Structure formats: C-alpha cells, structure tokens
Symmetry: D2
Subunit: 429 residues, 4 copies
C-alpha cells in the first residue's frame, strides 16, 4: 500500500510557505491547536477525510493531528487539490492521496486508500459532499459499526444523509455543520462578498461603479454579492421568488424586479439562486452590448450557456475562464468561468479566514462525536449552538475583539449560562 | 354597559384623518381587506383584542371587521393609547375601552369590558403581552372553552404561554407570531433603525456625524441602531456577550470592545441588550461631558438610572424625556426617556409600515385559528412559514416590487411548490 | 436710545441653559475663546452684526466679546430669532434688538439700533444676507469710511457684494466666508444630511426604507440628502442638469433621470436645485398616492405650490407645516413646510456643530480684517485657506481627532509650511 | 526611418481584441468619434504623443486619427507599454515606438522617432509627464515655433510647465487637464477606489472584512481607498496632516489618528499621501504579524522600504510584487509592489472607464488648441469648464443617465446658458 500519492512531493516547501501564511488567516484552527495540543481530545481517532486538498484544508488536517488524531486524506473533487499543499501534508507523514487532474477512477481510488490505517480501519468520517460517506455505506458497510461518527459541511452531503436516514441506510451518527451560523455566514455571505468583484475584475478589469448589476437571488450568497457590488458604486437590482427575501432587499433600497425586465438594463449579471434557468436566450437577446454574465450559485445550471453556444455567431476567448460571445443581433455577451462559479474560475475561491470558519466547525463536530458518542443516536444532528459559538469565539482574537462576559447576576437575569449558549435554537442572527 | 369609553369622542375626525394616512403605509393590512372583505373569513368571530390603542392598531381593528369579525378592544398599556385613534374606532361603532393615562384599576376594567359582546362572550383572543390571555385563564376560566384560538406577538406573551402550557394552565390553542421573520425583522431591526436617531434628534437635535456611538448589543435592535448611526457618519462601537453577534459586527467593520472601555470614548450610548446593568455608575464617571445616554432595549433595566438619581449633583430637565445630569466630577450626562425606550419617549414609536408587518401577522394568526381549528391542538404554535411569506408578499405591492414566480420546471427542480414555502424551517434569512 | 429690545428678557435663564448645552457642540467658537480671551485680538472693534438671533448665534456673539470686541446685534430675519437666546444676550449687557415676529419696519429699525455704540459708530460689519451692508451703503454712507471691514457668509450677500463692487458702490473691504470649505461643507452637505430625514419624520413619521426618494439636484445639498436617504434604505433617484454632478451620482450607484420620469416612481421628493420649476403640476398629476413632497433648496421657488392650491380638490392640514392635498385624480400629495425649507419648517434647522463651523468662519474673517486692514483693498476677498484650515482644526479636539504634524523634512519635500496652507487654491477636497 | 518599433507585431490581433472590448468602456472617446469623424476637427494636425502605450491609450490614439489628426506615439514609461496594444496601433499604420522593457537610451530614442512625420515635424504635443515637452524645448527648440499647442494631464507635467513659464522657457501654449474635475476625480478617487482592493487581493487573496485598514492621507486617493475598504467590511483608520481633510474623514465616521498610534493596530496599511516617510521602521516594529503594507500614492517615497531591506532578518518573495519580510522581533511584514503603486504592480491599473475620462480630456485639449489658437497665448491654461462638462456628458450615455435640460426660463433665472457652464470656477463639487 502507498504511504501517500501526490502530484509532486517536491512542492512541499512551497506548500509549507503557503500554510505558514494561511495559518495567520485561520485563527480558529490555530486556537484549537493552542487549546488541545496537550489534552489531545482526538487521541485514538482515525479520521478519514474527503475534502478539497487545498492549503486551507492542509491547516485543517494538521490541526486534527495536533489534537491527537490519526488522519488519512483525499480530495472531494478531482481538480480542487493544490499540489504544493498536498505535497506538504504528504511530506509531513500524513497519508494523503490527491492531485489536481484526477480521473473518476483515481478519484474513487484515492478515497479508498484512506479507509484503512496502520492499526485498523477509520473510526471517524470528516466529509464534504458525502462521497466518503456513500462509499462506506455502499461499498464498505462492513466498516460502519466501527465508525463512531460523521461530520458533513455541505448542502449536498446533508441532503444525502437525510435520504439515507429516511431510507434506514444511515448507520453512523452524523453532525451537520452546514447549517451552523459560523459556517453558513462565511461560506455563503462573507465568502462570496469577498470574491465576486475579485472574480469579475481579474476576468475583465471592468469598472464597477456606475454599472447596473443584476443579482438573481437574495439569499446569503445574493446578499453578499449585492453588498459587495453596492460598495463599489454599482446600482444593484435584485430578482427573487421569495417574498420575504425580496422584502429584505427592498428595505435596503435595492430595486427588486424580474430577470425578464432587468435583462434589458443590467451591465453585469450575477446568479446566486441555486436554481436552473435564471438567465436564458430571451434574456441574452435583450442585454446591452458586452453585458458581463456570471454565476456564483449552483455548479453551472443557472445560466443557459448551451443557448449561447448554439446561438452565438461568434465566440472569442479573451483569457482563461472569460469568453466573449457575439449574438445574431450584433451584441456581445461576456461570459465568465463558462457559466460555472466565477469565484472559482476567475479567482482563488474563498479567503482563508472563511475556510477557517467552516473547518473549525468540522473540528468541533469531530471532537463532539468522538468524545460524546453516548449523546448521538444514529441520525443527522445539528452542531450544538455552544459549539457554533465556540467557533466564532475562536476567531475573535485575530480580530482583536474584546468580548464582554455576563456577570452572574446578568446570567441569572437572562436565564442563561455565563458560557452560553446565548441564543435559543430558532434565533436567526 | 358602556358601548365604549374613550377620552374625548370628539377627536374622531382627527383620528380618522390619521388612519387614512396610516392605511397607505400599512399595505399588508389593506391587502387583507381587498382580498377578504368579500369572503368574510372571520365571520362569526367575536375577537377581543388587547393592544396599544394606536392609529396603527386602529387600522388593524378595522381590517378585522372588514374580514367579518366582531371586535372589542382595550389597550395593553395605560399610556400607549392615542385618543384620537380610539375616538375614531368608537365612532365607527366598535366597542373600544382605552385612553391615555389610565389607572391600574381602569386598565383591568377596560380589558374586562371586551370579554362580553352584545350577543355573547368572545371566541378569539388577539393579545400583545399576554394580559388578556392571563386575565381570562385566571379570572374567567369559564370563558375558556368557547375561545377557539389565541395569537401573541410579544416575547413576554410567548414566554408566558410556554410556562402556562408547561404547567397545564394553557387551555386554548395559541399561535406565536413574535418569532415570524416579517414580524421580528420589522419589529426589532427595521423598526428601531428608523426611530433611534429620530428620538435622539428630537431630544437633542445634536449632530450625529463625527460622534462615537457605543451600541451595547448586536442583536436585531443593535444591528438596526448601528446601521442607522453609521449611515449618519458616526463611528459605531459595539459591545457584545455573544461571540457570533460580535463576529458579525466585526465583519461589518465595527470595532467591538467592552463598555468598561468604550465608556471613555462614546459621545452617544445606546443599549439594546435586553439585559440589566449595561451602563453603570463607573461608566458614567468616565464619559465625556454631555454624553448622550439612551436605551432602546428592555424597558428600563439596561441603564442604571437609579445611580444617576442618587449620585449626580444636578438633575436638570431640558424638555420632556430629556434630562441633563451633572456629576461630582463636573461633567454632565444627557439621559433620554428617563432610561426607558428612546423611540417611545422621544419619538413616535415604530413607523406605520413596521407595525403593518406585526399586525398583518396577527390577522394571519386569527384567520388560521378561526378557519383551521382542527390543525391546532392546545399549545404554542409558530406561525406557518407560508403565512409569514404571505405577510411579506402583502407588502411587496406598495414597494412596487415585482416578485418572480417559479416555473413548474424550476419548482420541481427545487423540490418546492410554486407558492412556497420557499425555505426550510431552520433558514435564518 | 434703548440698551436692547427683546420679546421677553425673562427668558434669559432658559436661554442661558440652551447656550451652555450648545457650547459643547460648538468647539470651534469655544476654541477661539480659549485662544484669544487674553490677547483680545478684537479689542477696539465695534462689531454690528445682522444674523438670525438664535442660540448658536448667541455663542458667536459672546465669542466676539471675549475676543475684546464691542458688539451690537440684530437678526437678519423677522422670524429666525429664538427669544430665550435674545434675552440671554440682552441680559448679558450686549445690545441686541430682535424677537420672533418682527414687522418689516421693526426689522429695519432693529438693524439701525446696532449702528452707533457707546463711543461711536460701528467699525466692523458681520453680515448674513447683506442687509446690514446695504443699509449702511444706501442709508448711512457717512459711516463707510469709519468701517474697517465686512464679513459675509451667504450666497445672496456675496452675490450682492459683487454687484456693489462691479458698480463702484462697495467702499469697505469684504471677506467672503460663504465659499470657505468648512463653511460650505457644513452649511450645505453635512447640515442638510443631518436634518432632511429629521424634517420628514417629524412631519410624517413615515418609514424611509423601501421608498423611492427622488432628489432633484446633486450639489452639496443634494449630495447630503441623497446620502442621508440612502442610509435609511431608500432607493434614491437623482435628477440633474450638470453632467459633472450627474456623473458623480452615477458613480455612487444612484439612478439619474429626469423629474418628468421620476415623478411617476418617487414616494418622496426632495428639491435641492436652487432653481425654479422643479416639481410642477404635470409631475404632481403623475405621483403615487400620498407621495411626500418637500424642498430643502431655495426659499419656496422649487415646487409649484401655487398649482397645488389652485388645482387640488382638497387641502387637509395634518399638523403645522404639513398639508395633504387631494387632486382631481383622487391621489393625495403630502406637502411639507408649504414648499419652503423642510429642515426649517419641520425641524430645528442645522445642528449646532454645523453652525459652529459657519460662525467660526465669521470670527476668523473679523479678526483678519480688523487686524490686517493693510492686506485688504476695497473689494470682495475669499477667506485665506490657512484661516479655513484653522476653522477645521478648531473642531478636531471635540472630535478627539489626532492630527498628524509634518516633520521639517516632509514640509520641505512637499514644498509647504508645517502650519499650512496644505492645499493650493484650486484644490476641491 | 522605421515605420514603427514594437516587441512583436504579431500580437496585433490580440491587441485589437482588447481595444474592441475597451472601446465599450471608453464612451467619452467613442462619443468624440461619433461626433467628429465626419467634420475632422483635427485635420492638418500632426500630433506627437508620449503616453503609456496601453490598450486604453490605443483607443485614445485611434480617436485622434478618427478626428482627422496624424499621430506618432511613444510611451512615457519604459515599462508601461502593453505590447499587444502597441502591435495593434502599429498594424493600423500609425507610427508607434514603444515596448515593455525599454532602456533609458531606447526610451529617449522612441520619443525622438515621433517628432518627425512623413511630411513634416509635429505641430501638436499630447504629453503625460512633460518628457516630450522637455525633450523638444531642450533638444529641439527649432521645432517649437511650428507647434500650436500642448496638453498635459499629470501633476509633474503641469508643475514643470509652471516652472518653465516662470523662467521664460515655455514657448508653446499649454492646456492643463490634470486639474479638471472629470480627470482628477476619476484619476485619483474613482480610479483607486476600483483597484486598491483588487491589487491587495491578487497579491494576498486575504479577507478584507474584519481587518483594520490604516489609510495615510484623506485626499482623493485616500477617500477612494477608505471608501473601498469600508465597503468590504474593514474598519478604516485615517491619518492626515490637513485639518480639513481630517474633519471630512471624521464626518464620515472614520477614526482619525496618527500613524505612530495606528501602526500598532492596523492589519493593512495604505499610503496615499504623496509625501515621504509615512511608514517608518519604528512603525514596522509595532505592526501585527503579517501586516500588509502598500503604497498607492507617490511612486515609492511613502514607505521606508529601504529600512526593511536593511533591518529584516528575512525577505522572502511570495510571488511577483509580493514580499514577506521577517523582522528581528519575529513578526513578518507583507510588502506589496516593493513599496511602489499597488494598483500597478499587483493589479491592472486604472479601469478603462477611468482612463476614458483622462484621455477624453486630452482630446478636448487637443481640439481646443488646434481650432482656437487665438484664445491661448503662451502659458499654462486650465481646461475651460464647459469642456470638462462635455467630457462628463460624453460618458452619461453609456451609464444610460438622462440629463435634465434647463428651460429658457430656468436658465435665465439661474443666470446661465442652457448649455453651461453650470458652475463658477471655484465650485468644488
Ligand atoms: N460560489 C460559491 O463559492 C458559493 C456558492 N453557493 C451556492 O449558491 C447557491 C445559493 O446559496 P445561498 O445564497 O446560501 O442560498 P439561499 O437559499 O440562501 O439563497 C437562494 C435564494 O435564491 C432565490 N431564488 C431561487 N430561485 C430563484 C429564481 N428562480 N429567481 C430569483 N430568485 C430565486 C431563493 O428564494 C433564495 O432566497 C447554492 O446553490 C449554494 O450551494 C453557496 C456558498 C458559496
Ligand atoms: N425599543 C423598541 O422599539 C424595541 C425594543 N426591543 C427590546 O430590545 C431588547 C433586545 O431585543 P433584540 O435586539 O431583538 O434581541 P437579541 O437577542 O437579538 O439582541 C440582544 C443582544 O444583546 C446582547 N447582550 C446581552 N447582554 C449583553 C451585555 N451584558 N453586554 C453586551 N451585550 C449583551 C446579546 O448577545 C444579544 O445578541 C429586548 O428587550 C427587546 O424586547 C425589541 C424590539 C423593539
Ligand atoms: N435648507 C437649508 O438648510 C440649505 C439650503 N441651501 C440652498 O439649497 C440650494 C442649493 O444649494 P447647494 O447644494 O449648495 O448648491 P449647488 O450649486 O452645489 O447645487 C445645486 C445643484 O442643483 C442642480 N440643478 C439646478 N437646476 C436643476 C434642475 N432644474 N434640475 C435638476 N438639477 C438642477 C445644479 O446642477 C447644481 O449641481 C441653494 O438655493 C442653497 O442656498 C444651502 C444650504 C442649506
Ligand atoms: N496609484 C494611483 O493610481 C494614483 C496615485 N496618485 C498619487 O497619489 C498621491 C496623492 O494624490 P491625491 O490623493 O490626489 O492628493 P491629495 O493632495 O488630494 O491627497 C494627499 C493627502 O495626503 C495628506 N498627507 C500629506 N502628508 C501626510 C502625512 N505626512 N501624514 C498623513 N497625511 C498626509 C495631505 O493632507 C493630502 O490631503 C500623489 O503622489 C498622486 O500623484 C494619484 C492618482 C492615482
Ligand atoms: C486557495 N484557497 C482555496 C480555498 N478553498 C477551499 O479550500 C475549498 N473550496 C472552497 C471555495 O473556495 N469555494 C469558493 N467554495 C464554497 C462553496 C460552497 C457551495 C458550493 C460551491 C462552493 C465553492 C473549493 C470548492 C470547490 Cl467546489 C472547488 C475548489 C475549491 O478549492 C479551491 C482550490 C484552488 C483554488 Cl485556486 C480555488 C479554490
Ligand atoms: C404613533 N405610532 C405608534 C406605533 N406603535 C404602536 O402602534 C404600538 N407600539 C409599538 C412601537 O412603536 N414600539 C417602538 N414598540 C415595539 C416594541 C417591541 C418590544 C418591546 C417594546 C417595543 C416598543 C407601542 C409600544 C409600547 Cl411598549 C408603547 C407605546 C406604543 O405605541 C405608541 C403610542 C403613541 C406614540 Cl406617540 C408612540 C408609540
Ligand atoms: C436652533 N438652532 C438654529 C440654528 N440655525 C441658525 O442659527 C440660523 N439659521 C440656519 C439654519 O439652521 N439653516 C437650516 N439654514 C442654512 C441655510 C443656507 C442657505 C439658505 C437657507 C438656509 C437655512 C436659520 C436660517 C433661516 Cl433662513 C431661518 C432660521 C434660522 O434659524 C432657526 C431658528 C429657529 C429654529 Cl427652530 C430653526 C432655525
Ligand atoms: C491595462 N489598463 C491600463 C490602464 N492604464 C493606463 O492606460 C496608463 N496608466 C494609468 C494607471 O492605470 N494608473 C493606475 N495610474 C494613474 C496615476 C496617476 C498619478 C501617478 C501614478 C498613476 C498610476 C499607467 C500609469 C503608470 Cl505610472 C504605469 C503604467 C500604466 O499603465 C499600465 C500598463 C499595464 C498594466 Cl498591466 C497596468 C497599467
């Protein structure tokens, strides 16, 4: 068996430098190390993880080991791996099987390499997407009884765990950190607020101010995109199907209309609905010349890119992930990342600090399941709020934020603990 | 039995004028009238309501009557009644017992005058605070079996219902709208965002820009206040005990520190915590000369006003609800609304539009319990999300927002009905 | 001759309290006292001032006396006088002739009472509007040769001084502080940014967020109004005739269209053009029901109020300075301050801090002319930039702003003085 | 004589593609072409231009040719040339001598190749920096009499012209567009507001929100930077030596303190002062670990980069224009663009729209001097306001802004022409 398997393990030094720079932007993970490198709460844990092997992820991996756990890793996407990051981890003596440009077979193979450790099979699952979880349940059920828990941080993964639980397939308790506030806020709102303009600029260097940016959807992703754009002097127009979300947009002074109407006025189009058929041929045919069109929501189903390919009389590539289509009416459309996520194809994805919040959630989930099995029956569970609060608290230091502490008299008055949780479950923040 | 009892019935024309103006700012309620006047969904209902007899409440009252319900009213606070509003309601032929400046005996007496209608006792309760709910359960248990449902819009009322239900005292199904998105956002965040500065201005007419505003708490009230203040050019400093809220404030660029520290720097102080002992004497002794101190949170437990009264060298009234205290150190503290709600004592409370969201929620709850009893066993129930969205949709027309409608293909793709609910119960917005 | 002449000199105590509260918001004037109560740079000066006798103005008056000058005063408007402020000044032993509600004759008479002092005629003119300056040049030219200077802070006054100089009528050097940055920025942008929403709220208490506010003009007044409104969640629409100003608005994300178009969409209308015929009958006839219309620009020539009076089928007064007209089409228009300045009729005018900037400019001008006659030939002169900077610097303390100081090496490098001026004359800020 | 000299003429197609895209972002220039191609206002003109041979400049060049002028070009910086842009210009048949990576001898040689045209010497100078202007006056005085005019858009160029004129060296009428509103606002404020964060992101991809950004200087660059940063959720701290600018920052709610103080708190540092010694070693020794330090002001005199090179324990290159220094205290400083302009070394410079305003100003100046020589005696002249407004109007169409036109009654009332100028020379905007 291979001790690891990466593109080029000689990229380790480069990777190490990147990690040392990333560590400063990932205080939540570092705070965990500072608090648990001694008590080692993950001692005895054999964590098989399936998550984009990136620099940020590497910091997550080394955080787990510092907490006393045995860790074997694989990416959860065949292109997400940053080889110098994978090398660094491999070089550190941690079994990592990942590299940019894997084939479906290799991808599957990589996840299988992480199943058995030096002294036995995994006993913990840290997933992102559910692949690792499905592989075990479908192909290696013999290992389920030996697995103490599963932590999942994606919508897909959680949706999948629910179907499994609904079908009596799930055999391991799973903690969903996708819906924790610290995870969702950063992964959806803040993360995208930081990268949208970044992806659009690197792709076109266009001036934002003075332009009409139509943002389909006003959820967390949409909210952050709208906020970012507004911050640059763009007149943001929102489209929405949810009356509640629409009202929120209206209360911020954003015009809320339909795509069918806005397509005639927007200079920049951003989709964040997570729904199909947002921008279509009839919308394209109405757009102003050189209207920039991009998606930051769901994979590539929001924009009808196929229509552009089948109807444009021209298709000129300006630069990677930036294409300029000319339409039969003579107007050109500038499509980014080929209809895929603009912040991935035209930028570097989420900032490290954002990833720190998501991963510090994975760590919390891992510690919670590993040390409190007795508390979790097979099924999908939300991350305890006190743990979600612990994540945010772990990031306050870096922000040099002085958190106030309730006096015993105040806690009694409020009917809560000095250490929380400070909010009821239904609280929306 | 008096057909009603109001200060001076001759204020009806004035009240009627105020309501007419208010209606245009309360589309949610007007939408209900346009959509239900013909079908009379509240036909047969004998609704007893205990809610501040204001102009806004008046519009809610008449909306209930338009929907076919019989109505008898009383204010839920001895000072909250706007006589002209009550006068208009009384002249319209609706039994209303409320006037500004009631006594405790009169207050109780007013609620009692609403329990019995011309042709029988009430069968529906619309409450704000749980007074009416308690009065009946404790003093009129005999009337409980003929009451179909209860709707409550306040935190106190809801908590109360919970204790009741917990102890087996609750005998009528109740719907909590206090926690609905449309109600909470407008009642907490948007509402205060519109009035905070309005109150401070009327009280002092001071220049906001350039001042350091310390806002204790970053919940919805804090968020709304910090936003309002920042919009005016004031540097906002946040204090918080919850790491999640503190992190959110930090993400918006607000310095988050402790009051013990900010008290030496703030020009304006605003408490929105809902907790006691926020601004104490040790903070006062540190404040800059003429610091403006106000509470827009919990009644009067946030600011230690008692300390001021017992430690200041002077307590000079500047104008109603505005007091300038002089301390031993020679500096003066400008206290607003005597440490009570600044937007109530120094302003006109929540804008009509805000109240519309709260009250339209009430109408929804009333219609739900009256038409679908079968769906509500005795207990505290959250307003179904589909109705919360309907409250929001009802306000989109005035804002002239054009909501998008999912196509069957999109709805099927999204796994939701074209008419909602569009979000899961845990969605935080 | 009367030693003074005010409405009720028994309002002095009340006035004194107001001044003591205002003093904290007028650091620039107080800084002058702290720096010149000893050297008394105005010693020998007999300043006749014609400026709205308000609390803020009172602080200006007492600042001049502290600087060693003899001062006699009159308002520059028959309604601007705040009697308790006038009393305080009278009670202090300073000849003040003003009171709210003067007649044209009394108004004229009041200015004449300030011309001769205990030991001779005035020798300095501190004007606001030019009346005092015209009275002397037209009716008392015999006094011109004995007058050493004139300071003017209004557009009208300065425009007038230019005509006088163009016609060889001006006989005294005049310093124009209307165009100083500290004066203009506060008097136009900041001042109106602070009061617009204040005037609109006190008049209607309407919710700003979610509304479309059309702001005619994007100069300093327009800029501040737009900024204020945007800060509340209103979708601001701008109208402009200047391509440069319009472009600025577009760069901030504001839609810029014509009134002819916006009148169909605005909920709130604010005029700041300083031009006639902004909102007309054809605009009114297109407005949404209860559209709020107000002017914060020029006196009362921007809105065609006369049309409303001559064409409305109804005119209902909601409260002072707030009228609701009903049009033949059935829609109602809510007009504020009868077409006049909304921040004057529905609010308390400019905040004290704003007035502090304008007046600290008058003081600077007064000191400059009185002590440096040799530097000013008859004619209109701009306030030296170093003096304009001195005004801003005088307000930094209150703001607890730590201004950096150029090192000798930096000054030489920049080719400027450690003490300024720091900017060339054409610099726009 | 070479018809031109560019890196690789085979990059023309690429350059042509970039220009086509750029044109849509440079309406000002395209407006000139549409409005003047037929009348050829620059007919007979032999224009020699020395301006960064960029894609944006290319559009300016072709605009000049469309207006009937002959053109020969050279870059005004040995590194600013974008070869593909120069290739397109060369292929279009325009003599252009520029390529990235020139030497000092080549640079000089390139400007010389533009002085003589096929049928005679130049008669018009379009300069950016004053190089071309100096070269001719000092090395080619014989060509001076046949040169009708000069247009300069940089501060250095303008100051230079002033010294020249002062010393009697200037022999050709020159128009300064550096101080026009459209040029200055876009070149200083808007330009940097669009690129600052873009540069910081490409260099570090760091999370802006939650960070403390210290911006030294609050001029237009500082204003734009502070705005951009604040829009991203960063708490902005301002340092200033000018009390007026400092007061403006305070009015927008920015804490204004000294670098000596803020150096201990900033996560990001941005210098925009145009002054030397802003960030010194004593500041560095105080900064938080991994503080990002960058200059977007004056070339490289603002940050003491020499101190870093001589005092750091390490100087590790992270990527081009991004260096991580490690200090004796063990902390690291992330320096961008080696202390030079961050938006140039870590971004793509000013957006095309911004450059359009600068270059459209150039066209205006060229047309003015060529068609109205009689109006310009030898000397430095400001671009007439009416033309500055025309530059702005030329960009309103793309923004799809609908400017309002004064009626004769309004114009007569305002005392101005329906076509402007709409503002006096001292108006600051
Ligand atoms: N690019 C990135 O880095 C990230 C992408 N995402 C993805 O973005 C998508 C949305 O994410 P969130 O904002 O968190 O979800 P959300 O549920 O908060 O927001 C989606 C919003 O789009 C609206 N919407 C749906 N169909 C619409 C339509 N047809 N027209 C107009 N509006 C419509 C919904 O009412 C909803 O409010 C998801 O697919 C999510 O997985 C999430 C985080 C980051
Ligand atoms: N004035 C008005 O018109 C309104 C007043 N309220 C009242 O305002 C209060 C708070 O309401 P929301 O903002 O909705 O609640 P919330 O729970 O959203 O906000 C309260 C926040 O204060 C923070 N906090 C508590 N103790 C603190 C302390 N000692 N120091 C610093 N921060 C502290 C908490 O972490 C919490 O995030 C309640 O009492 C509520 O009933 C609510 C709506 C309107
Ligand atoms: N209410 C108050 O407390 C104050 C009132 N003002 C008054 O407000 C007015 C304007 O003041 P500023 O903003 O300082 O002047 P400004 O000259 O900076 O602004 C006027 C703007 O209105 C635009 N404009 C003119 N006619 C227009 C039209 N017909 N349609 C659309 N836009 C048009 C102009 O292009 C100009 O940019 C003046 O009359 C001034 O005296 C000034 C300060 C305070
Ligand atoms: N990076 C780019 O793309 C651009 C760079 N610039 C350059 O940026 C610099 C400044 O330009 P602007 O903002 O237009 O000038 P400005 O004069 O408007 O701003 C400079 C400001 O820095 C302040 N300042 C000077 N020394 C200071 C010190 N020692 N400490 C704190 N503050 C100090 C001044 O009071 C002044 O307000 C110039 O060198 C200019 O040429 C201009 C446009 C674009
Ligand atoms: C270099 N820093 C990389 C940080 N990113 C990661 O570690 C893993 N991430 C997360 C991420 O950055 N984003 C933007 N996600 C959040 C999300 C939620 C829901 C649906 C889609 C997405 C996309 C991630 C996710 C996906 Cl689908 C694909 C690649 C990913 O990693 C990289 C790797 C290299 C680069 Cl140059 C950029 C990104
Ligand atoms: C004149 N417009 C009146 C609109 N207001 C109403 O109808 C009833 N309201 C609601 C309200 O305006 N606010 C600000 N609430 C929301 C809230 C939630 C939780 C705790 C405290 C509060 C205070 C309300 C509530 C309370 Cl406790 C006391 C009085 C009230 O009415 C008035 C009546 C007259 C005037 Cl001049 C102003 C207000
Ligand atoms: C109570 N604080 C009063 C502060 N105000 C003053 O001292 C004198 N001011 C200045 C002022 O507040 N504004 C808003 N100006 C600026 C301006 C510039 C150009 C054209 C019109 C205006 C109106 C002023 C000007 C005019 Cl025209 C009429 C009255 C004035 O005083 C008062 C007096 C009482 C009250 Cl309750 C409010 C205001
Ligand atoms: C690719 N887009 C290029 C647009 N830029 C240009 O055309 C010429 N510009 C202007 C510019 O973009 N900026 C940011 N200036 C404005 C300014 C004013 C005062 C002092 C310094 C500066 C820097 C410009 C100026 C200078 Cl000093 C050096 C290079 C320049 O061009 C490029 C060329 C290639 C690239 Cl990849 C980026 C920029």
């Amino acid at each position: 068996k291979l001790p690891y398997k990466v593109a080029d393990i000689g990229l380790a030094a480069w990777g190490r430098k990147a990690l040392d720079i990333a560590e400063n932007e990932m205080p939540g993970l570092m705070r965990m190390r500072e608090r648990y490198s001694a008590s080692k709460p993950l001692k005895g844990a054999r964590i098989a993880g399936c998550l984009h092997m990136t620099v940020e992820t590497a910091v997550l991996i080394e955080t787990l080991v510092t907490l006393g756990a045995e860790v074997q890793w694989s990416s959860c996407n065949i292109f997400s791996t940053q080889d110098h990051a994978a090398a660094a981890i491999a070089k550190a003596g941690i079994p990592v099987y990942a590299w940019k440009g894997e084939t479906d077979e290799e991808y599957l193979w990589c996840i299988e390499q992480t199943l058995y450790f030096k002294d036995g099979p995994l006993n913990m699952i840290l997933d992102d997407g559910g692949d690792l979880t499905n592989l075990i349940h479908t192909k290696y059920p013999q290992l389920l009884p030996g697995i103490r828990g599963i932590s999942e941080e994606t919508t897909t993964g959680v949706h999948n765990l629910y179907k499994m639980m609904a079908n009596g397939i799930l055999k391991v308790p799973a903690i969903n950190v996708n819906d924790s506030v610290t995870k969702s806020k950063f992964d959806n709102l803040y993360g995208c607020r930081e990268s949208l303009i970044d992806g659009i600029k690197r792709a076109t260097d266009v001036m934002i101010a003075g332009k009409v940016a139509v943002v389909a959807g006003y959820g967390d992703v949409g909210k952050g995109c709208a906020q970012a754009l507004r911050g640059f002097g763009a007149r943001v127009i929102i489209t929405e199907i949810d009356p509640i979300n629409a009202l929120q947009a209206a209360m911020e002074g954003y015009e809320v209309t339909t795509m069918d109407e806005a397509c005639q006025e927007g200079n920049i189009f951003v989709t964040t609905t997570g729904c199909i058929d947002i921008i279509l041929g009839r919308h394209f045919e109405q757009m102003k010349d050189d209207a920039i069109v991009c998606n930051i929501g769901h994979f590539d189903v929001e924009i009808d890119v196929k229509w552009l390919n089948e109807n444009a009389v021209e298709k000129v590539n300006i630069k990677p992930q930036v294409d300029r289509y000319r339409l039969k009416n003579g107007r050109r459309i500038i499509l980014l990342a080929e209809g895929r996520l603009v912040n991935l194809g035209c930028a570097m994805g989420h900032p490290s600090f954002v990833m720190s919040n998501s991963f510090t959630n994975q760590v919390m989930a891992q510690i919670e399941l590993w040390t409190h099995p007795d508390k979790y029956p097979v099924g999908v569970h939300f991350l305890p709020k006190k743990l979600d609060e612990a994540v945010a608290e772990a990031h306050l230091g870096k922000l040099n934020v002085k958190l106030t502490k309730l006096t015993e008299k105040q806690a009694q008055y409020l009917g809560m603990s000095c250490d929380g949780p400070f909010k009821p479950d239904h609280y929306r923040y």
